[PDB]
């Protein structure tokens, strides 16, 4: 099994570089840095990370077609791939409406735009002069001078709905699924397979990645507590098909949703229960986490991304995962 | 007088970092890195440059409102300012039509968009939750988490026309003028002053910067030759008011324009003459260059940006400028 790690670049980039280099030392193979306008720029963060790392794969996790021209994304990826000696991955997803309303960006046809942007980025990265007259992306003779080192930089697609999952199956080298429980991938993976089948692609060409909320501790209950704030948000933003799939107490969810609107948090955090924790996080001892990763592996997950909080102390957790989780999951 | 240096990031970023650190060692105070989708990403280049430098000011030279959301630009600048210990400048201009047709980007109202984007970036950098309902830029509750170190990161506006010059006078901390000859600034500076006056601003608040084609050599004629390719492009793209202002042989210009369309270059380069060289470059011995810089200083230029080619050998020229040009122009 492959392990990724995901960071929001919301701290001094030096601290981020320490965490990633630590992750690299601990056998993490993918480094995913989120891309939101209000934090440190994802590509500058990834530049510093590249300089402090040597082998971990690294890229935006995820960027989107809208906040920069896909052509800019292409050459940012090319640049990253040059600096890192060929370790770049492109995680790219739809973005979100609450970002694009804030930025005055029209959220046009997200499936179509993501598909067309991935195709344009790929062609640009391949060195082509691109003429692409899509429904949304319209490129007329663009060409990169900067070249990646990889022949084909991997493109990971953020995918939640069925059309996105199928599209990821047809076009993407990996699928980034914000989900921590096997039930989600039991539903998700056949959709990826339909898209793969539609393109004649084997599933072994496709890295199904769990963008999981993870919290590992030598003490299971402290792992629990660090998971609680993050599960509260995940549970609030989960679509009802995901709540229903997991039998989530729907009354607790709306009290959490309410208290989040109310800007107060301990009450929202008080209503996360053991069921939502099981559905939206991988928490507990390294033993707890290892069994849970195996259940995801058995469901077809090939990359598990340790997302926030990682653990009560991120440094302590990265070390624990490297010592006692990743070695327990070597094919 | 202040000296800047401008680089296209079209080489391995390590080489760029050497040049900038060399420039810094040689007393250059500003480092301007161009922002075009087809080269190395400007902000990743500036991240590495920051890590290899300590005191030179550095920023995009220039970015634009269109290839990334102004909000992304704001946090890229904030990020740069954090990494560099407060040395960021934002050079921002309109972009160009031949880039945005290639990218399918509508080149909407460039003066208005540049003005509104500068205002939004400033407010974002200041830490505000921004609601900005402009004619073009429409921001609704955006806010940065990343903070600059500078209280007010300097915004330099690329400006060529009279409306841009006046707008730069009203709003910008510097004006980036792609021009090498005093006649251009004799025309340009009163326009900046009109805008400054319209805002109650003194000219001593405004860094009038010559984005010059510079070529310095111990041998004047070799400096000449290295200037010839770059002047050929500048002369082809110059507006007729600039050709007319300089009495440029208009027949030579169209042969250069023709041969550039024809994709062949020695014939285009053969038709650069001593008049276009004088109008669109600062070339020659360090003595030649120093007198020419003084004539620009006397016209109101407060920053001279050594643009390509810098000299026949960029490393040799940066050293010559630091040894024999910059010290000869210390107020």
Numbering used by the authors:
A (entry chain A), B (entry chain A): 1 to 331
Quote the study's own text:
Methylene‐tetrahydropterin reductases catalyze the reduction of a methylene to a methyl group bound to a reduced pterin as C1 carrier in various one‐carbon (C1) metabolisms. F420‐dependent methylene‐tetrahydromethanopterin (methylene‐H4MPT) reductase (Mer) and the flavin‐independent methylene‐tetrahydrofolate (methylene‐H4F) reductase (Mfr) use a ternary complex mechanism for the direct transfer of a hydride from F420H2 and NAD(P)H to the respective methylene group, whereas FAD‐dependent methylene‐H4F reductase (MTHFR) uses FAD as prosthetic group and a ping–pong mechanism to catalyze the reduction of methylene‐H4F. Mutational analysis of four functional amino acids, which are similarly positioned in the three reductase structures, indicated despite the insignificant sequence identity, a common catalytic mechanism with a 5‐iminium cation of methylene‐tetrahydropterin as intermediate protonated by a shared glutamate. Based on mutational and kinetic analysis, evidence has been provided that all three methylene‐tetrahydropterin reductases have the same fold, similar methylene‐tetrahydropterin binding positions, and the same basic catalytic mechanism; however, the binding modes of the C1 carriers and reductants significantly deviate.
Glu6 at the C‐terminal end of β1 points towards the deaza‐isoalloxazine and pterin rings. Position A contains a glutamate residue in all three reductases. In hMfr and jMer, apparent k cat of the equivalent Glu9Gln and Glu6Gln variants decreased from 594 to 1.3 min−1 (0.2%) (Gehl et al., 2023), and from 18,200 to 71 min−1 (0.4%), respectively. Neither variant showed a significant increase in the apparent K m for their respective C1 carrier, suggesting that glutamate and glutamine bind in a related manner. In addition, we obtained the crystal structures of the inactive variants jMer_E6Q, and hMfr_E9Q to exclude perturbations of the active sites. X‐ray structure analysis of the jMer_E6Q and hMfr_E9Q variants were performed and the structures were compared with the wild‐type enzyme, which confirmed unchanged active site architectures compared with the wild‐type enzymes. Based on the mutational analysis at position A, it was possible to extend the proposed model of the catalytic mechanism of MTHFR (Trimmer et al., 2001) not only to Mfr (Gehl et al., 2023) but also to Mer. The mechanism is initiated by the protonation of the C1 carrier to activate this molecule, followed by a hydride transfer from the hydride donor to the activated C1 unit. As the methylene group in methylene‐H4F and methylene‐H4MPT is chemically a rather unreactive aminal, it is unlikely that a hydride can be directly transferred. Therefore, the formation of a positively charged 5‐iminium cation is crucial for catalysis.
